[PDB]
From a paper:
The monoclinic crystal of 3.3-Fab/PEG complex contains four Fab fragments in an asymmetric unit. Each Fab comprises the N-terminal VH and CH1 domains of the heavy chain (named H, I, J, K) and the VL and CL domains of the light chain (L, M, N, O). The asymmetric unit can be divided into two pairs of Fab (H/L, I/M and J/N, K/O) related by a non-crystallographic two-fold symmetry. In either pair of the Fab an S-shaped PEG molecule was found at the pseudo-dyad. It binds to the N-terminal side of the Fab, which corresponds to the complementarity determining regions (CDRs), in a symmetrical way. On each 3.3 Fab molecule, about 605 Å2 (or 3%) of the 19,600 Å2 surface area was buried by the PEG-mediated dimer formation. The heavy chain contributes 445 Å2 surface area, with at least 10 amino acid residues involved, and the light chain contributes 160 Å2, involving at least 6 residues. Therefore, the observed 3.3-Fab/PEG-550-MME complex was probably made up by two 3.3-Fab bound to a single molecule of PEG-550-MME.
Polyethylene glycol (PEG) is a water-soluble, low immunogenic and biocompatible polymer formed by repeating units of ethylene glycol. In this study, we determined the crystal structures of two PEG-specific Fab and one nonspecific Fab in complex with PEG. Both specific Fab/PEG complexes share a similar dimeric binding mode that is very different from that of the nonspecific complex.
Author numbering:
A (entry chain L): 0 to 212
B (entry chain H): 1 to 131, 138 to 218
The structure:
């Protein structure tokens, strides 16, 4: 099988910057059967460039493709916000058809502090003997961020589940959700519940708390 | 427009069988090559199977890992393509896209999720998350299996300021959350409701967010 390698897997770029993504084959691939797909999370991959250099319908003119034999590349002339996505190269010159690992393309923007919101357990979940405290850390940049939970001042790390969104296409920010799950008994045994976020935008953490009283 | 409706996904125990169907519309089905592609977090994008048009052999082609287990077929009279899968493995878990190719142009469906596991299907519990020019509300979708669930707000008309987070698996149960940010004059003045669909359990739950 022809194996395609897209290195690096992740790449950051400035607005207006000329970006280039590479795709390397282990053997020769006919240029007619080398294509590129774009994918944004929660949506299917879309044909972006076909036969090495031909833009699909809807793709803006700042995109281009190039290469031959064993080395191909996709190039964006002026990076824009809507261009932040995953890009896969694909070959069907020799079967089986194979994809590259893909390259995550992220755009840079002015640092932004997270909007933090904390939510106590709902009465419905309590009726079932569980208690989840939720913390949303929305619309921040860069993606590097830390969150920690405190129960009555004591740091907690068990029962914590985190989840991160990919870069937003309109404002280029990131978001995060943290859920601390306890038993109803454990939850009723304490008072202060705290979610604090450490981000590159402040020396002191952003703190959101609530008391069961 | 081109439309490819996939079905047949869901939960299956290891070693079992399942058939995926894809009903096509919006183009001359007999002219197009029909393919199945798979996507998973661990294995990435994988071409699974292909069947060409009658004009050039009607020849099927398969990926190495699925040879002898997967069977691809097409019914031009029904504009449908099918993928029969026998003796399924954990590695077969993923999102399966039906695609169609005419000339160099190709089209992908939204996909259907196939999960190979011995765990049991369980419906989600939907909990409201209620608490200054903006206010943030949310829904916690906990304890469901398998993937996926779909989340909208006010039946899709409230799309701005929404963050639906990827699911997290623990103890064979998935949990995700969704947040929405609205002007403070609009809530609780106007209603805010999250809609959670879990097709594997044939469940849909609407939760109106009301203050505490």
């Amino acid at each position: 099988q022809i194996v395609l390698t897209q290195s690096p897997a992740i790449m950051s770029a400035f607005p207006g910057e000329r970006v280039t993504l590479t795709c390397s084959a282990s053997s020769s691939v006919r240029s007619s059967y080398l294509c590129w797909y774009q994918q944004k999370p929660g949506s299917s991959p879309k044909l972006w460039i076909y036969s090495t250099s031909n833009l699909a319908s809807g793709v803006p003119a700042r995109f281009s493709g190039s290469g031959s034999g064993t080395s191909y590349s996709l190039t964006i002339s002026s990076m824009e916000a809507e261009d932040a996505a995953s890009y896969f190269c694909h070959q069907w010159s020799s079967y089986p058809r194979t994809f590259g690992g893909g390259t995550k393309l992220e755009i840079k923007r002015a640092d932004a502090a997270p909007t933090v919101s904390i939510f106590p357990p709902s009465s419905e979940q309590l009726t079932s003997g569980g208690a989840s405290v939720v913390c949303f850390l929305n619309n921040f940049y860069p993606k590097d961020i830390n969150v920690k939970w405190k129960i009555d001042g004591s740091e907690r790390q068990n029962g914590v589940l985190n989840s991160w969104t990919d870069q937003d296409s309109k404002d280029s920010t990131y978001s995060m959700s943290s859920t601390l799950t306890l038993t109803k008994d454990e939850y009723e045994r304490h008072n202060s519940y705290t979610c604090e976020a450490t981000h590159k935008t402040s020396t002191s953490p952003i703190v959101k708390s609530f008391n069961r009283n | 427009e081109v439309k490819l409706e996939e079905s047949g996904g869901g939960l299956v125990q290891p070693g079992g069988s399942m058939k995926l169907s894809c009903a096509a519309s919006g183009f001359i089905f007999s002219d197009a090559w029909m393919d199945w592609v798979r996507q998973s977090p661990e294995r990435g994008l994988e071409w699974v199977a292909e069947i060409r048009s009658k004009a050039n052999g009607l020849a099927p082609y398969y990926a190495e890992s699925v040879k002898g287990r997967f069977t691809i077929s097409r019914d031009d009279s029904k504009s449908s393509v099918y993928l029969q899968m026998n003796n399924l493995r954990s590695e077969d878990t993923g999102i399966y896209y039906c695609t169609s190719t005419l000339y160099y142009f190709d089209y992908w469906g939204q996909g259907t999720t196939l999960t190979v596991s011995s765990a049991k299907t369980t419906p989600p519990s939907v909990y409201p998350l209620a608490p200054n020019s903006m206010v943030t509300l949310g829904c916690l979708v906990k304890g469901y299996f398998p993937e996926p669930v779909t989340v909208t707000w006010n039946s899709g008309s409230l799309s701005s300021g929404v963050h639906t987070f990827p699911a997290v698996l623990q103890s064979d149960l998935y949990t995700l959350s969704s947040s929405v940010t609205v002007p403070s004059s609009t809530w609780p003045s106007e209603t805010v409701t999250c809609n959670v669909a879990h097709p594997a359990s044939s469940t849909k739950v609407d939760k109106k967010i009301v203050p505490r």
